[PDB]
Amino acid sequence: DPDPMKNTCKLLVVADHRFYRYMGRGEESTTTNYLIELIDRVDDIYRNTAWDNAGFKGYGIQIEQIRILKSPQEVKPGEKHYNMAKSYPNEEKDAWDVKMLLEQFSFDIAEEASKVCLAHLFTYQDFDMGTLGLAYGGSPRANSHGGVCPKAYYSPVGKKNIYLNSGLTSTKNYGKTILTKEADLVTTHELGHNFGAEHDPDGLAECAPNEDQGGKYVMYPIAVSGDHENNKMFSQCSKQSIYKTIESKAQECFQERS
Ligand SMILES: COc1ccc2c(c1)C(=O)[N+](C[C@@]1(c3ccc(-c4cccnc4)cc3)NC(=O)NC1=O)=C2
Ligand SMILES: [Zn+2]
């Protein structure tokens, strides 16, 4: 019998009412299929990366559970929820303030997020300044305040434990639905932050090549289009950061590939 390999970060995937209506065409099957195919293509990127440029490969992601929120969350006055009909803090805007939305999703999904490596929200809202997603950055440290593997942080206001093993992806930008190849890269980038990578800096040519050299890698701070070969790959900078996080945290919460 082969030795067990805890090499898979299991995900709770949530599609809010906005995603369900505008991406899933108001259908469970259409919503599910989009998310399953997207996670699998993102998994091909992770699972195939040799994090240490040798044998530290086969580390990826798998959906553990899909939660579909078919309707907006009914809220009482002064109450907020990441799945409510209105955007917060400004109801006049198409989208929430992205940082407040991530905080709100982490607060509301807490009980479910405590049981998975990562929780990821899929929404359909046009965040300001070309923002397509947000995630808490991971690290090898036990008290990382985010990323892979749930760690309880108590909320005195909520009187409960909250977890920062979260991220979100929007498939809406500049009033339109983004291409699927763009959506795959956003989730890759967000999970990249969760797995411990920071943005690729301009100061290290190796991690930020010119367009004639295959373009930028996935963790570049200006969102890659997917048009260039490097777009769907992690730079050597991301590989070193992620390798250190995985090495420390796979034994904590990664599981066998299902
Ligand atoms: C390939 O997909 C992407 C590549 C690069 C990026 C993105 C997507 C994307 O949304 N962004 C913006 C961005 C971001 C980060 C912080 C804040 C922020 C900070 C403090 C207070 N309020 C908000 C807003 C947006 N989201 C992300 O994952 N990285 C960022 O730079 C870069
Ligand atoms: Zn980023």
Distance CA 152, CA 161 (A): 5
Mutation pick for ligand 1 pocket among 170, 189, 217, 218 (CB with most ligand atoms within 8 Å): 189
Residues with CB under 6 A from ligand 1: 98-99, 131-135, 185-186, 189-190, 193, 221, 223-224
151 touches 143 (CB < 8 A): yes
Q: Which atom of ligand 1 is nearest to the CA of 220?
A: 5
Apex 123 CA angle, 119 and 129, nearest 5: 110
16 touches 123 (CB < 8 A): yes
Q: What technique determined this structure? A: X-ray
Distances (CA, A) of 248 to 117, 145, 214, 243: 14, 15, 31, 9
Cis peptide before 89 (omega within 30 of 0): yes
Binding residues for Zn(2+), by number, are 189, 193, 199
Tell the residue nearest (CA) to atom 21 of ligand 1. 99
In degrees rounded to 5, what are phi and psi of residue 180?
-60, -40
Q: Which residues of 26-61 are buried (b: 16+ CB within 10 A; e: fewer)?
A: eeeeebbebbeebbebbbebbbebebeeeebeebbb
At how many Å resolution was this determined?
A: 2.0
Q: Please give the structure tokens belonging to residue 200.
A: 């690729």
Distance CA 257, CA 188 (A): 19
- Return the CATH superfamily for domain 1-258: Collagenase (Catalytic Domain) (3.40.390.10)
Q: Which atom of ligand 1 is nearest to the CA of 131?
A: 10
